[PDB]
């Protein structure tokens, strides 16, 4: 209302209990790690990742909001 | 000392100021998003990602600690 999806996600993180946050971050990080391994196995690098970001700013901004929403809902619901 | 890297990262998130957290999460999420796009462009899917996780548990646990450390140091230092 008086907050962006970003601002609301941060507030959710700041006020989350340990169990809820650990469950959500563990799985998100596991995803991250797995994607790095799958990309390297493909011969793709961190540089290709950063350049994708630098060249697709509108795409990135849109998905960032969806991620703020998704992860916040998981935390407030105690999910994974 | 009396805390795991996981416990210390969570404490860091919980006590972080808005600017510090937003900067660190924005870039981490941007990375995430970019890696999803690069994997799909390769014809790799979310299912391949989850199965990687399920079959490489020791690898995942080790990297998760490194991520807890890395992101916490960025937040406590106000970095990106």
């Amino acid at each position: 209302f008086n907050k962006t999806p970003k601002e609301k996600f941060i507030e959710i993180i700041q006020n989350g209990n340990l169990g809820a946050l650990e469950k959500v971050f563990e799985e998100f990080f596991a995803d991250h790690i797995a994607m790095v391994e799958l990309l390297e196995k493909q011969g793709l690098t961190e540089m290709d990742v950063k350049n994708f970001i630098l060249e697709n700013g509108d795409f990135i901004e849109e998905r960032q909001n969806d991620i703020y929403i998704e992860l916040g809902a998981k935390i407030l619901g105690h999910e994974g």
Side-chain angles (χ1 to χ4, degrees), chain A residues 2-22 24-78 80:
Chain A
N2 294 334
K3 284 164 192 184
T4 55
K6 184 168 52 181
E7 293 164 352
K8 194 179 181 300
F9 167 78
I10 302 301
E11 285 200 339
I12 286 165
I13 261 47
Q14 290 165 328
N15 293 284
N17 63 298
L18 182 73
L21 298 168
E22 287 177 344
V24 176
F25 287 109
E26 292 164 3
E27 216 61 35
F28 195 75
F29 292 170
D31 265 54
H32 208 86
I33 292 153
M35 292 190 287
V36 170
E37 292 304 297
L38 301 169
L39 285 178
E40 295 184 18
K41 292 284 176 54
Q42 262 40 234
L44 283 165
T45 71
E46 177 55 11
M47 185 173 345
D48 299 330
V49 166
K50 292 291 192 191
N51 287 333
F52 177 93
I53 295 169
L54 296 167
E55 296 170 353
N56 294 276
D58 296 7
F59 183 86
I60 300 289
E61 180 178 349
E62 172 74 17
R63 286 300 309 170
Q64 282 169 320
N65 294 320
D66 298 329
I67 288 178
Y68 300 140
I69 297 169
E70 160 220 0
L71 290 182
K74 272 165 171 170
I75 291 170
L76 285 176
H78 299 252

